[PDB]
Design an enzyme around this catalytic site. Sequence first.
Site, PDB file in Angstrom:
ATOM      1  N   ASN A  70     -97.720  14.080 -93.956  1.00 14.14           N
ATOM      2  CA  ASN A  70     -98.397  14.124 -92.666  1.00 14.14           C
ATOM      3  C   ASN A  70     -99.573  13.166 -92.728  1.00 14.14           C
ATOM      4  OD1 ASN A  70     -99.624  14.627 -90.263  1.00 14.14           O
ATOM      5  ND2 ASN A  70    -100.155  16.777 -90.715  1.00 14.14           N
ATOM      6  N   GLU A  91    -104.410  21.903 -86.848  1.00 13.87           N
ATOM      7  CA  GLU A  91    -105.352  21.115 -86.043  1.00 13.87           C
ATOM      8  C   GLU A  91    -105.024  21.213 -84.582  1.00 13.87           C
ATOM      9  OE1 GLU A  91    -105.895  18.568 -90.063  1.00 13.87           O
ATOM     10  OE2 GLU A  91    -104.798  17.588 -88.401  1.00 13.87           O
ATOM     11  N   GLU A 132     -99.461  26.752 -94.385  1.00 16.74           N
ATOM     12  CA  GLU A 132    -100.647  25.965 -94.704  1.00 16.74           C
ATOM     13  C   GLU A 132    -101.856  26.836 -94.404  1.00 16.74           C
ATOM     14  OE1 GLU A 132     -99.939  22.060 -92.486  1.00 16.74           O
ATOM     15  OE2 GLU A 132     -99.398  21.609 -94.594  1.00 16.74           O
ATOM     16  N   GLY A 166    -107.481  20.122 -96.196  1.00 14.99           N
ATOM     17  CA  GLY A 166    -108.533  19.127 -96.283  1.00 14.99           C
ATOM     18  C   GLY A 166    -109.795  19.537 -97.015  1.00 14.99           C
TER      19      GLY A 166
END
Lengths: 249, 249
Positions: free
Chosen positions: A10, A96, A166, A172
Site C-alpha cells: 500500500n 485512514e 491492521e 505508521g
Amino acid sequence: AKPQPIAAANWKCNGTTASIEKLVQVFNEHTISHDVQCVVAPTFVHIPLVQAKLRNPKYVISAQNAIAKSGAFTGEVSMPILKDIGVHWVILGHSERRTYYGETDEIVAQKVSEACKQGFMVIACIGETLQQREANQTAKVVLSQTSAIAAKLTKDAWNQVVLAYEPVWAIGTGKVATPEQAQEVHLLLRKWVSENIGTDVAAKLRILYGGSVNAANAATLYAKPDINGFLVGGASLKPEFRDIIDATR
Amino acid sequence: AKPQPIAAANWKCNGTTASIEKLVQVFNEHTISHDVQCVVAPTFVHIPLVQAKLRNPKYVISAQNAIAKSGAFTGEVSMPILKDIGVHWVILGHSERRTYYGETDEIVAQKVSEACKQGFMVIACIGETLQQREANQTAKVVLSQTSAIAAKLTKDAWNQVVLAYEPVWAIGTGKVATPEQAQEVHLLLRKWVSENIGTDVAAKLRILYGGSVNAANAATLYAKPDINGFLVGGASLKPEFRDIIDATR
C-alpha cells in the site's frame, strides 16, 4: 495447509515517476520462487505507469479505494472505470478512510459488496483502535466490522475476499503487533468465518496482518498458523519489500 | 476587453479507454482559431491516457481534486504528485465535493491556497443552493465562499485563480441559469474582487459559468460582459464540447 500467501504494498499517497520507476525495477529484478500473490497499490494517477513498468510475474496491481458507480462524483474513481483500465484488485475500508474520509462500517460493507459483484479481488481492512484494545473490545470490534461486510455478501463472493487485520495503533507508529497479538486475532477471525460463512471458506481465506510490518519482523509473524501475509505501508516504498515477500516462504 | 476565455471539460467520474480515445480524437481534429484556454479534467486514472492522446495545442489537463500533501492518506492524490506527473491545473471546491465529501469553505480555501503555493492554476468553484437562492442569499453565499478563499491568498496568487460560478440548482438538472441570472452574479463577484483584491486583478480574472451549459445556450451566455467561459459537465463528454469552445469566440 495455509492458502496462497499475499504480500501487498500500500504505497498510500506517495511517489514520483522517478521513484516509482526505480522501485519497480527493484521489484522486477527480485526473482520470486514460491507461490505468492504480490500486490502493488499505487495512487490512481500512478496506475498506468505501474502497469507499463511492472513485469514481475508474481504481481498484480490494486487500487487504494473506489466508489461503486460512475457518474457525477467529481474527484472520485469508480469500480467500472478501474475494471475497464485493467485493475481488478481494490483495497477497501482502510483505517485512514474510516477515520479521515467518513467510511463507516455500512459504507465499507456496501463498497465491498459492490466490488465483489463487479469481479474485484478485495482487500477488506478491519482493526481496532488503541482505546478499543485497552477496553478489551478487540474481538467485538473486528467481528462487528467483519459481520457488517458479511451481511452484504453471498457465500460465493468470499472467493474474492481477503481480510487485512491492521490494528490502528500499529499503522505508521513504529509499534508492530507481536506474533502472539496478531495470531490471537487472526484465529478468532478465522473461527468466526468458519462458523458463520463456511468451513471451506475459512480454510481458503487469506487473513493478512498490517501495521508496521518490516523486513525484520515479517518472518516470525508469518510463522503463525493463521497469518497469510501482509499489507505493508511504509516498508513497501523501500527495497525491503523484497524481504517481506520472501518472509512468506 | 475580456481576458482570455476558458472552456473547461469536467468529465466527473466517467469514461472508458475506448470512449476517451474517441472523444479526444474529436477534440484533436477540431481546429481552434481564436485565443482560448481549453481544459480537460479526466478522472485521476485516466490522466496518463489523456496526456498520451490529447494533442490539440489549445488544451491543458486538469485534475478534478487533490489533497495538499503526500503521506499516509490511502486513496487520495496529492498536489506534489500531480505536479510531478505534469498536471498543474486543478478544480477545487466543486459542489459535489462540498456536498458529498465534506469540503467546507475552510477546507476549500485551504486547498486553493496550497495549490497556488504549489504553482497550480486553480478553478475554484462557488455557488448557491436552490434554498439559498429562494431566500435571497445568492450574493451573501457566493461572496462568503469567495472571501473565505481570498483570506488565504496573497494578491499575487490571484494570477493563478479562476472562479467558476456554478449554481447548485443548475448542475446536472437540465436547468441552466439564464444569461441575466449568470451575469448578475458575475458582475457582483468581479466588483468584490476589484474592491477587495485589486482593480488589475479584477480586470484579468476569469469568472466562468457552469451548470447545464450546452452547445445551444453557450453563445448567449458568453455574450454577457462578465462571463469568461464555462465549466462544463455532461456536455463535455460529447462532441458538442467543440461548439462550446467555439461559443467563446
